[PDB]
Point group: none
Chain length 77, copies 10
């Protein structure tokens, strides 16, 4: 028996934005205190650990539009 | 027996936004105190741990529209 | 016996927004105190743990429209 | 039996943005204090650890639009 | 049995941005204090560790649009 | 007329204390938030004002015995 | 008329203390937030003002015994 | 008329203390945030002002006994 | 008329202390943030102002006994 | 009329201390952030101002006993 598979998705999407003016932003963190304690650490896989951090991030993108698209075709016999 | 499969999705979506003016934003964190205690840590898989953190984030995207689209076709025999 | 499957979804959706002016935002956290205690931690799978955190987030997107769309076609024999 | 597979996805998407003016941004972190303690650390896989950090990031991209697209075709016999 | 596979994806996407003026940015970190303690460190794989850091980053790209696209075709017998 | 005044107070008081062991004391304040608003402030005398404060005090004296003694003799004619 | 005044106070007081062991004291303040607002401030005398403070004090004197003694003799005619 | 005044106070006081061991003291302040606003400040006298402070003090005197003694004799005619 | 004044105070006080061992003291301040604003400042007298400070003091005197003694004799005619 | 004044105070006070061992002291300040703003500053007297400071002091005197003694004799006619 013959098997025919056609996979023709179509996309014409648009992701736009507009901003006349963007600014005057203040970010003033006032310190902190962090203390961690451990003995053994065994990470053996796709691990993404993060231990004992004091971080400040200022992320101001003028655009910032994100589009994610995944296609998957699995054929088995 | 013959098997025919046609996969033709169509998209014309739009995700837009507008903002005349965007600003005058203040973010003032007043410190803090964090303490953690542990002995053994075994992470063996797709682990995304995060231990003992004091973080401040200011995220001001002028746009910020997000679109996610996944297609999956699994064929078995 | 022949099997025919046609998969032709259609989308023309729109997700829009408008904002004449957006601003004058204040975020002032007054500190805090966090303490955690543990002995053993075994995470072996798609784990997304988060232990002992003191976080402040200011998220002010001018747009911020989110669209999620998933298609799945499973064929078995 | 003959097997025919056609994989012809089409994309015409656009991800745009506009910003008349973008600036006047202040980021003033006020110090901090971090202390970590450990004995054994065994990482044997695709590990992405990060231990004991005090970081400040100012990320102001004029654009900042991100597009991710993955295609996968697995054939088995 | 003959097997025919055609893989002809097409892309015409565009990722653009515009910014009339971009500047007047201040980033003034106020010091800090970090202390770490360890005994044994065994990393034998694709490890990306980072221990005991005090970092400041100012990333202001005029553009900053990122596009990622991966194609994979696995054939088995 | 002759006036004779004799002022011979006598003190032999003792103020003692004993403590075999004194310790293991924890004081962990969890932040706070204070806001004050005023226009005019006129202090012209022995004034001891204190406005808008967030204070923490740990006072652990091993002794701490206090003795106050005042003598006053006023003669008028 | 003759006036005779004798002022012979006597003190033999003692203020003592004892402490076998004194320690193991923890003082961990968790930040805070203070904001004050004013226009005019006129202090013309023995003024001891204190405005807008965030203070932490750890006072652990091994002794700490205080003795205050004042003598005053006023003669008028 | 003759006036005779004798002023012979006597003191033999003692202020002592003892401490076998004194230590193991921790003082860990977790940051903070202070903001003050003013226009006019007129201080013309024995003024001891203190405006907008974030202070930490660790005062551990092994002794710390304080003695204050004032004598005053005012004669008028 | 003859006036005779005798001023013969006597002091034999002692202020002592003892400490077998004194140490193991930790003082770890976690940063902070201070901001002050003013226009006019007129100080014309014995003024002791202090504006906009972020201070840390560790005062560990092995002794630290303080004695204050003032004598005053005012004669008028 | 004859006036006779005798001023013969006597002091034999002692201010002592003892410390068998004194040490192991840690002082680790974690940065900070200070900002001041002013226009006019007129100081015309015994002024002791101090504006906009970030200071750390470690004062560990082995002795540290302080004695203050003032004598004043004012004669008027």
């Amino acid at each position: 028996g013959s098997v025919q598979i056609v996979y023709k998705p179509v996309d014409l999407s648009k992701v736009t934005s507009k901003c006349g003016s963007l600014g005057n932003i203040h970010h003033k963190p006032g310190g902190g205190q962090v203390e961690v304690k451990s003995e053994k650490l065994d990470f053996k896989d796709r691990v993404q650990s993060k231990i004992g951090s004091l971080d400040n991030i200022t992320h101001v993108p003028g655009g910032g539009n994100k589009k994610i698209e995944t296609h998957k075709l699995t054929f088995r016999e």
